[PDB]
Design a protein around this nucleic acid. Structure first.
Ligand SMILES: [Mg+2]
Ligand SMILES: [Mg+2]
Ligand SMILES: [Mg+2]
Ligand SMILES: [Mg+2]
Lengths: 215, 177, 205, 110, 132
RNA sequence: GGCCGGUACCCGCGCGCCGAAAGGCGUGCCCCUCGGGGCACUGCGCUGCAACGCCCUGCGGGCUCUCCAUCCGACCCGUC
RNA sequence: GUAAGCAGAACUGGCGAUGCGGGAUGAACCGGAAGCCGGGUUACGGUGCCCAACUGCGCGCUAACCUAGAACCCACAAAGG
RNA sequence: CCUGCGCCCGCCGCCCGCCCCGACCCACGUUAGGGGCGCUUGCGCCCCCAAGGGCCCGUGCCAUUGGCUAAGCCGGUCCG
């Protein structure tokens, strides 16, 4: 219904409703409000020679990426790129930036609760029942890096010293993975053989055609 | 499914003229690949038979004829006029096929093969169903027998679709009829 | 013909009873694609058209020699392996680096010299006599053709292939016995596992 | 085979680099031709159309800690009736590149 | 002697095209190449012997039967189940099931077949040691 | 699925609330009358799409410079 | 003119002055006339290898013990069996 | 035969460079026929269409830490 949606959105009356010009006929009496003259700073510190153009605070409000039809909270994905390729994970929930949020769990797979792009995953037809996992604590800030300054060039005394020390991933993430993998193993033992499944990794051995291979 | 020929009937007449204010009407049964070619053949036969040209003619109706029972085999006869390299001749051809429409295809193919005669050189004088026990050609007559049985001397070995086919195969195929 | 695209280090071809030119085009495209091929039992390649026709074709080929220096002219080979290698070179572009690198991947033999006995010998379906020649039309074996254009090793291939066939037959009998005892093992383990093996009931044959 | 060393998962479907987009007398080195192991139909490449490949080779000198180089590309569209594909690369391939093997992953997957 | 002839009623597997795998009864032959195939879900149509693979089952019917008569003859000769249960049609049935295994079922088949392999290996080694 | 573009107008945004968000939310007419749909009065201003990466004096980046290999093209210029 | 890839005219187009795709090769035969690039689709002609595209789906005839035969011009065959 | 200050060969301690990603698979033979197993060695039963099949821990960050280890498998290596 892409084009029916196009017309239904495109109606002048429906655009009145959508922009909500009522409740703009509410506040300023029985009429549409005036607008005024901002920008009375009158204090330019320096005058560029080129014709000046201000910063773009972008007013375009892009649509959200559409999560694939074959993705359900609880679906066993297939990672495809990066250090966890072949790893089979379980999809927790497609988070607010658009990226998928998956888990090993780390007790069996070594794949922590981590962010994965939707492009690099192949949803399998199997599901798990996980409506009693409490995932609300995960978001973009949990994962946002605050990547540090490039003044630290990794030298012969940094190489294994970072391995040998622990100034790394924090202990609240340590405890996090414990709570999620507990409440998710309690959901995996239900599905027979699934722990062994997830323990395996998908390998496209000889005589395997992906166009033929279902998932 | 699709048929390379279709038996139309075209009905036409000369343009109105002050005398003979209703010019007489001609019907024909023509094979072609579509409407416009059937029409263009119709004016051919009413300009070499009935002295009427497309300019000084008018076409009133063109119907596409279909077949009664596509599910049954019908011994067909075709009486046909054709041009060899050094003259003209007249042929009679008996076919077994489920439709006259398929019989005409089979007949152009036979004239293009047995005689290198193309389509622009062939005319179908008369077509009819020459039911069994009255057929003339031996190759038609030899399928008029229940309790028929014959094995398949010629059977292409071939994978069901283009996907299943590879270039090397371990075992020499087992062919048996 | 674009190739199979298969992944073997070497693909052998039991070239017994295949059409010379058809096997030659299939193999030539495999070489140009870059997959290393080895064709054996070349002494058996069947060629359409009777033996007398292939004869006169080859004896016309003998006439073609450089007048002022026969040592420089068309080099007429006799052994079936080299007949095949020349028929394939006629199909590969052999005056460029790509084409000569292609022919570097071809190795053609009469018989099956070791280590090509203990191996699966793959036949190319698009070229077999049974599938490409109507039964009853003239054909000749490149072994007979060379035996009559003066390749003096038809005998010496023949004793060696009799020896190789008997040495293969004894080992095939041994593998029959080993496979019938593996089959009794097949059923012995199946009867020892019950519901453990239900999942393979519908996809087994 | 058993008890082997090498890669432990194949997440890519191997193929040969086949030539270029050629007429009978021209090359347009921009679009290469690629054969995937296992595709035998023009509609079987429908599922590969878009999936990304890598030409992996190795030079004479170390760079960034390796001899290995890799030039990236992707399956644009089908070519012919037998599942050969046309590949578009960031840089056009070498002509020594044809006959060698190229890795077709499934990354940009659907 | 030949074991199999194109003749009235013989059921044939169709082995090429978009209708691969169907059984069809050759109820009448057009000429030395084309015959009429009658099928339960497919209406009687001509199809060419190059696209038919003759099977082992014959049903004993008339020429161009009435559809009800052909269906009851298919029941009395039991072609569906005999075709399914014979090795040739079991090949097609198993081949479509292996077509329709997904990733996790394929994994469980892998497990079951590793364990089967180990069992056969151990049993064979024991009986080979019993063999002297 | 492929290639191109990425916004001074076409779109889009604020001027109300609810909603992290796609989005929803009002009045009056016409329509079938479930579902629900059509139309409607319209105003000010603003108006360069995003997210995360990799490298940063390096065994890096890329070069229009040089040599070489491969593929395709390719006859020796002036002239009657 | 016996004819000529000859000599002289009529209508038009081409080459000359013009690349490019096809006819293996060719100034004028077929397609088609152009700034430099990215993407798509075609014309002529093709899909066995050289060589990009099917050893595709069909039906017939030919069996050539002469170099069977295989492109508009075009690289011929005749009377006659 | 094999360089008296030269070389060859074995082992293990490794480093690079090549190749590769399961780089697993011995029948002959015809195709107007054939293949496996039994007993009259002639006849039963079964199977024949494509390796489109079989086989292999096939499942470990090319692979975390230690320990025991059946039966089985695979490799290096001595023997024949
Ligand atoms: Mg030259
Ligand atoms: Mg002069
Ligand atoms: Mg283009
Ligand atoms: Mg090609």
């Amino acid at each position: 219904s892409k084009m029916a949606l196009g017309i239904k959105r495109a109606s002048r009356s429906h655009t009145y409703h959508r922009r909500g010009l009522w409740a703009i006929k509410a506040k300023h009496g029985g009429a549409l409000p005036k607008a005024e003259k901002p920008a009375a700073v009158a204090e330019p510190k320096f005058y560029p020679a080129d014709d000046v153009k201000p910063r773009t605070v972008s007013t375009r409000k892009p649509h959200p990426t559409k999560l694939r039809s074959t993705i359900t909270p609880g679906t066993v994905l297939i990672l495809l790129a990066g250090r966890y390729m072949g790893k089979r994970v379980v999809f927790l929930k497609q988070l607010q930036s658009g990226l998928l949020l998956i888990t090993g769990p780390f007790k069996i797979n070594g794949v922590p609760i981590r962010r994965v792009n939707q492009a690099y995953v192949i949803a399998t037809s199997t599901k798990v029942d996980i409506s009693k996992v409490n995932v609300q604590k995960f978001d973009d800030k949990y994962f946002a890096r605050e990547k540090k300054t490039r003044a630290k060039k990794t030298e012969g005394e940094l190489f294994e010293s970072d391995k040998e020390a622990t100034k790394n991933l924090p202990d609240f993430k340590k405890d996090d993975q414990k709570v999620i993998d507990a409440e998710l193993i309690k959901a995996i033992d239900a599905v027979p053989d699934l722990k062994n499944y997830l323990g395996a990794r998908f390998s496209l051995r000889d005589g395997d055609k992906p166009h033929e291979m279902t998932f | 499914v699709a048929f390379r020929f279709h038996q139309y009937q075209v009905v036409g007449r000369a343009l109105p003229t002050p005398g003979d204010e209703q010019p007489k009407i001609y019907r024909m049964k023509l094979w072609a690949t579509n409407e416009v070619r059937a029409k263009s053949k119709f004016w051919y036969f009413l300009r070499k038979l009935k002295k009427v040209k497309k300019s000084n003619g008018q076409m009133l109706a063109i119907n596409e004829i279909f077949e009664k029972n596509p599910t049954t085999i019908k011994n067909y006869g075709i009486w046909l006029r054709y041009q060899s390299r050094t003259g003209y001749h007249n042929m009679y051809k008996e076919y077994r096929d489920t439709t006259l429409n398929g019989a005409v295809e089979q007949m152009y193919t036979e004239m293009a093969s047995r005689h290198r005669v193309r389509s622009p050189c062939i005319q179908i004088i008369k077509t009819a169903t020459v039911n069994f026990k009255l057929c003339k050609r031996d190759n038609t007559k030899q399928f008029h027998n229940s309790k028929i049985k014959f094995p398949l001397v010629y059977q292409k070995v071939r994978p069901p679709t283009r996907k299943l086919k590879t270039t090397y195969k371990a075992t020499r195929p087992n062919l048996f009829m | 013909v674009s190739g199979s695209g298969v992944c073997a280090k070497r693909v052998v071809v039991d070239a017994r009873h295949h059409m010379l030119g058809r096997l030659a085009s299939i193999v030539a495209k495999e070489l140009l694609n870059g997959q290393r091929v080895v064709v054996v039992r070349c002494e058996e390649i069947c060629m359409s058209g009777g033996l007398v026709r292939q004869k006169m074709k080859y004896l016309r080929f003998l006439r073609k020699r450089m007048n002022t220096k026969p040592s420089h002219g068309p080099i007429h080979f006799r052994a079936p392996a080299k007949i095949l290698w020349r028929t394939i070179r006629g199909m590969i572009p052999h005056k460029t680096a790509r084409g000569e690198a292609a022919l570097a991947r071809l190795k053609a033999y009469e018989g099956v010299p070791p280590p090509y006995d203990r191996t699966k010998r793959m036949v190319i379906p698009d070229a077999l006599k049974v599938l490409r020649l109507q039964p009853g039309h003239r054909y000749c074996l490149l072994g007979q053709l060379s035996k009559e254009v003066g390749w003096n090793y038809a005998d010496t291939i023949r004793e060696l292939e009799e020896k190789r066939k008997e040495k293969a037959k004894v080992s095939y009998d041994r593998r029959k016995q080993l496979a019938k005892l593996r089959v009794k093992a097949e059923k012995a383990a199946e009867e020892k596992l019950g519901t453990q093996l239900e999942i393979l009931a519908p996809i087994k044959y | 085979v058993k008890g082997r060393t090498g890669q432990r998962v194949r997440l890519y479907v191997r193929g040969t680099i086949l030539g270029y987009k050629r007429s009978k007398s021209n090359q347009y080195e921009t679009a290469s031709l690629v054969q995937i192991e296992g595709v035998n139909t023009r509609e079987d490449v429908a599922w590969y159309g878009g999936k990304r490949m890598a030409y992996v080779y190795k030079a004479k000198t170390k760079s960034n800690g390796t001899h290995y180089r890799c030039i990236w590309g992707k399956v644009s569209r089908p070519h012919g009736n037998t599942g050969v594909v046309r590949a578009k690369f960031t840089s056009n391939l070498p002509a020594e590149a044809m006959g060698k093997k190229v890795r077709v992953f499934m990354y940009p997957s659907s | 002697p030949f074991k199999r002839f194109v003749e009235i009623g013989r059921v044939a597997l169709v082995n090429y095209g978009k209708d691969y795998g169907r059984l069809v009864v050759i109820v009448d032959v057009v000429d030395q190449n084309r015959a009429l195939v009658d099928a339960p879900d497919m209406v009687r149509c001509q199809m060419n012997f190059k696209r038919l693979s003759l099977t082992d089952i014959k049903i004993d019917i008339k020429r161009i039967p009435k559809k009800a008569t052909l269906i009851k003859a298919m029941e009395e000769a039991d072609v569906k189940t005999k075709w399914e249960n014979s090795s040739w049609g079991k090949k097609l049935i198993v081949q479509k099931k292996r077509a329709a295994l997904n990733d996790f079922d394929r994994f469980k088949v892998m497990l079951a077949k590793i364990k089967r392999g180990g069992a056969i290996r151990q049993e064979l080694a024991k009986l080979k040691k019993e063999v002297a």
